Design an enzyme around this catalytic site. Structure first.
Site, PDB file in Angstrom:
ATOM      1  N   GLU A 152       0.844  -1.187   0.000  1.00 45.36           N
ATOM      2  CA  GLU A 152       0.000   0.000   0.000  1.00 45.36           C
ATOM      3  C   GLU A 152       0.884   1.243   0.000  1.00 45.36           C
ATOM      4  O   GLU A 152       1.706   1.402   0.909  1.00 45.36           O
ATOM      5  CB  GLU A 152      -0.923  -0.010   1.209  1.00 45.36           C
ATOM      6  CG  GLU A 152      -1.841   1.191   1.304  1.00 45.36           C
ATOM      7  CD  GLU A 152      -2.848   1.062   2.430  1.00 45.36           C
ATOM      8  OE1 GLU A 152      -3.085  -0.075   2.893  1.00 45.36           O
ATOM      9  OE2 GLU A 152      -3.398   2.099   2.856  1.00 45.36           O
ATOM     10  N   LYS A 187       3.401   3.379  12.596  1.00 51.17           N
ATOM     11  CA  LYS A 187       3.801   4.431  11.668  1.00 51.17           C
ATOM     12  C   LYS A 187       3.646   5.813  12.289  1.00 51.17           C
ATOM     13  O   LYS A 187       4.449   6.711  12.013  1.00 51.17           O
ATOM     14  CB  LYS A 187       2.988   4.316  10.378  1.00 51.17           C
ATOM     15  CG  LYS A 187       3.338   5.330   9.298  1.00 51.17           C
ATOM     16  CD  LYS A 187       2.502   5.088   8.043  1.00 51.17           C
ATOM     17  CE  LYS A 187       2.130   6.394   7.350  1.00 51.17           C
ATOM     18  NZ  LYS A 187       3.307   7.101   6.770  1.00 51.17           N
ATOM     19  N   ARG A 224       5.099 -13.657   9.408  1.00 51.39           N
ATOM     20  CA  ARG A 224       5.832 -12.426   9.162  1.00 51.39           C
ATOM     21  C   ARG A 224       7.152 -12.421   9.935  1.00 51.39           C
ATOM     22  O   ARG A 224       7.398 -13.250  10.815  1.00 51.39           O
ATOM     23  CB  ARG A 224       4.997 -11.208   9.557  1.00 51.39           C
ATOM     24  CG  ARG A 224       4.776 -11.067  11.056  1.00 51.39           C
ATOM     25  CD  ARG A 224       4.427  -9.634  11.433  1.00 51.39           C
ATOM     26  NE  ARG A 224       3.118  -9.524  12.066  1.00 51.39           N
ATOM     27  CZ  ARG A 224       2.648  -8.418  12.628  1.00 51.39           C
ATOM     28  NH1 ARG A 224       3.369  -7.309  12.677  1.00 51.39           N
ATOM     29  NH2 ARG A 224       1.426  -8.423  13.153  1.00 51.39           N
TER      30      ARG A 224
HETATM   31  O1  LIG Z   1      12.106   1.589  11.426  1.00 49.86           O
HETATM   32  C1  LIG Z   1      11.072   1.343  12.064  1.00 49.86           C
HETATM   33  C2  LIG Z   1       9.725   1.411  11.458  1.00 49.86           C
HETATM   34  C3  LIG Z   1       9.487   1.765  10.199  1.00 49.86           C
HETATM   35  C4  LIG Z   1       8.279   1.916   9.424  1.00 49.86           C
HETATM   36  C5  LIG Z   1       8.207   2.307   8.102  1.00 49.86           C
HETATM   37  C6  LIG Z   1       6.863   2.425   7.652  1.00 49.86           C
HETATM   38  C7  LIG Z   1       5.966   2.123   8.612  1.00 49.86           C
HETATM   39  S1  LIG Z   1       6.707   1.688  10.085  1.00 49.86           S
HETATM   40  N1  LIG Z   1      11.080   0.969  13.365  1.00 49.86           N
HETATM   41  C8  LIG Z   1      12.141   0.838  14.242  1.00 49.86           C
HETATM   42  N2  LIG Z   1      11.831   0.476  15.496  1.00 49.86           N
HETATM   43  C9  LIG Z   1      12.857   0.455  16.359  1.00 49.86           C
HETATM   44  C10 LIG Z   1      14.150   0.771  16.006  1.00 49.86           C
HETATM   45  C11 LIG Z   1      14.349   1.112  14.688  1.00 49.86           C
HETATM   46  N3  LIG Z   1      13.364   1.149  13.780  1.00 49.86           N
END
Ligand SMILES: O=C(/C=C/c1cccs1)Nc1ncccn1
Ligand SMILES: [Zn+2]
Length: 573
Positions: A46, A278, A268
């Protein structure tokens, strides 16, 4: 050897193309004549956000199975929901597929089928298998048992009454939310994914690809299976989050007498210590805790790419994890170990000094010059990457932490009074003399102990001062959060940010021959016998190397010729 994931487990036990279980088995002759014993898969992101690391498993499973069996894989944007739909999401998705070494057989959109989908909404209505409801969101909760499920008066509307009302919805008759088009499924079924799902919602808004032509737009429950049938998807692979949705998936196809694609679900990829909200990550970018959606501390694909991680390391890592119906739970330390072991084999070694101190070799003349030839990768494949020459002379740099003005102890093997240190690929050691204070900086005076064979306790890296490249910034990255469950912090995930997650070193230097690594980049050294040797395009992220005693680095997006910016990909360990 290297056991491929496509011939094992979840993927290795999938059906053959053309043998998808059908309620009406005559719908395969039109399907078989299109596929020609080729696998056809999809990737349906998406386009309302960036892809994180979990999407790399979705990309590898779908494009890789198609490629492993010499089939085809669609790149299908799931723009069912019309919004602002910023063009950068569409480009970033394309780039991240192309970056991972997969080529789509055809790029499609969900909006491409709005006409054909509207025709099948009539066929479902004409089949007395759908109806138009004017219920409020609170009302349907009671009809679903927020309990005992009851029907609604709209479910028993005549077929001609459903046809009459739906043509009104098409022409912008009712407002947003006041009228829907619910499937007539089964209310006695215990599955909540079958309590008269909404198939069309009235939005009365422009779509970025179709404009104001459409005043009603379908839902995901209506779009996924039908667009899979249109594109003759032999294997429709998604995450186990939608395993209950496969009943309504297969229901809608069997209710419309169309080819029924086989939806098989895999677990997943869940990395520990990652937040996927997000909105939460949005909060970080806006308030400045990170410097963009591609910040090297994030587990988004753009950020992992900017961190300097090679695409093949990602794929090699997903492959060794395998694909089953069980959802994983993998520590980020195992991801960094995979990237570390990958760069160990595919990057040249350079000499870099993070905290330099100037050295003056007193007993050497200014015209003295000793050319020292060094291989880019010492080991079994020296002559493959080539050699380079550094000029050893009176003026060099070493690291502040490799020289101490007081006598050494049992844990210090480097330069000290009474303890000479070796210089990498230099014949004889340097011995300590004195430390001069000059211009605020410290300058260590040494002798070059020429002609005396004495084994040092260690060999440290060094840079010729005259031709040293001065680095504007070197960014040392660590985990963005202190804990493995930031959302469980008593004061909020913001109060769990690691303040030391980015350290910017302002005075680093590196040898002149980094200019040579940029010219040879993209380098694309291959791991022998590995199936994950992805070739990359030009870009600062591909300029990778190992600093001989500090770790692995690459050029950042913001680097220029007169302003180099380096990212520490992963520690040396
Ligand atoms: O990078 C993300 C999440 C990224 C997304 C992109 C699009 C929707 S969520 N989370 C993360 N959490 C803990 C440490 C590093 N990174
Ligand atoms: Zn109703």
């Amino acid at each position: 050897p290297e056991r491929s994931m496509f011939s094992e487990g979840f993927l290795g036990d999938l059906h053959k193309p053309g043998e998808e279980p059908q309620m009406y088995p005559e719908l395969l002759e039109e399907h078989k004549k299109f596929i020609c014993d080729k696998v056809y898969t999809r990737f349906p992101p998406e386009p309302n956000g960036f892809l994180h690391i979990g999407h790399s498993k979705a990309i590898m499973v779908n494009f890789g199975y198609a490629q492993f069996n010499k089939g085809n894989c669609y790149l299908r944007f799931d723009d069912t929901n019309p919004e602002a739909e910023e063009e950068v999401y569409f480009n970033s998705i394309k780039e991240m597929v192309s970056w991972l070494g997969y080529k789509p057989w055809k790029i499609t959109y969900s909006s491409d089928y709005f006409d054909e989908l509207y025709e099948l909404a009539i066929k479902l209505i004409k089949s007395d298998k759908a109806y138009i409801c004017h219920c409020t969101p609170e009302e349907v909760k009671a009809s679903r048992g927020l309990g005992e499920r009851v029907a609604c008066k709209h479910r028993f509307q005549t077929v001609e009454h459903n046809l009459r009302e739906f043509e009104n919805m098409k022409n912008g008759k009712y407002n947003v939310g006041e009228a829907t088009l619910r499937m007539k499924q089964d209310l006695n079924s215990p599955s909540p994914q079958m309590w008269d799902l909404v198939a069309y919602r009235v939005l009365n808004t422009p779509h970025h690809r179709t404009g104001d032509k459409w005043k009603i737009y379908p839902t995901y429950d209506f779009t996924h299976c039908l667009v899979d049938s249109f594109e003759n998807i032999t294997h429709s692979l998604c995450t186990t989050e939608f395993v209950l949705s496969r009943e309504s998936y297969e229901w809608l196809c069997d209710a419309l007498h169309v080819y029924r694609p086989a939806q098989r679900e895999y677990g997943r990829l869940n990395l520990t210590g990652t937040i996927m909200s997000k909105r939460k990550i949005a909060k970080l970018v806006n308030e400045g805790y990170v410097r963009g959606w591609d910040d090297p501390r994030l587990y988004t694909l753009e950020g992992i790419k900017r961190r300097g991680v090679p695409p093949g390391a990602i794929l090699s890592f997903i492959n060794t994890l395998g694909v089953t119906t069980s959802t994983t739970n993998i520590q980020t330390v195992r991801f960094e170990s995979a990237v570390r072991n990958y760069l160990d084999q595919t990057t040249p070694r350079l000499m870099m000094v993070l905290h330099p101190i100037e050295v003056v070799i007193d007993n050497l003349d200014e015209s003295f010059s000793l050319d020292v030839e060094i291989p880019y990768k010492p080991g079994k494949d020296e002559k493959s990457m080539g050699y380079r020459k550094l000029t050893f002379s009176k003026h060099i740099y070493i690291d502040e932490n490799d020289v101490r003005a007081e006598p050494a102890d049992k844990e210090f093997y480097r330069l000290a009074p009474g303890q000479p240190v070796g210089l990498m690929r230099v014949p004889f050691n340097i011995s300590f003399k004195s430390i001069e204070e000059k211009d605020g900086k410290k300058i260590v005076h040494v002798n070059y102990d020429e002609g005396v064979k004495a084994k040092p306790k260690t060999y440290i890296q060094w840079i010729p001062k005259d031709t040293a490249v001065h680095i504007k910034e070197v960014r040392i990255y660590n985990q963005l959060f202190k804990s493995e469950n930031p959302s469980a912090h008593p004061e909020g995930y913001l109060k769990d940010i690691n303040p030391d997650s980015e350290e910017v070193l302002r005075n680093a230097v590196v040898e002149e021959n980094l200019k040579d690594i940029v010219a040879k980049s993209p380098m694309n050294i291959e791991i022998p016998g590995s199936a994950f040797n992805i070739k990359e395009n030009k870009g600062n992220n591909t300029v990778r190397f190992q600093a001989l005693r500090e770790g692995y680095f690459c050029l950042d997006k913001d680097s220029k010729e007169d302003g180099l910016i380096l990212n520490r990909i992963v520690s040396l360990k």
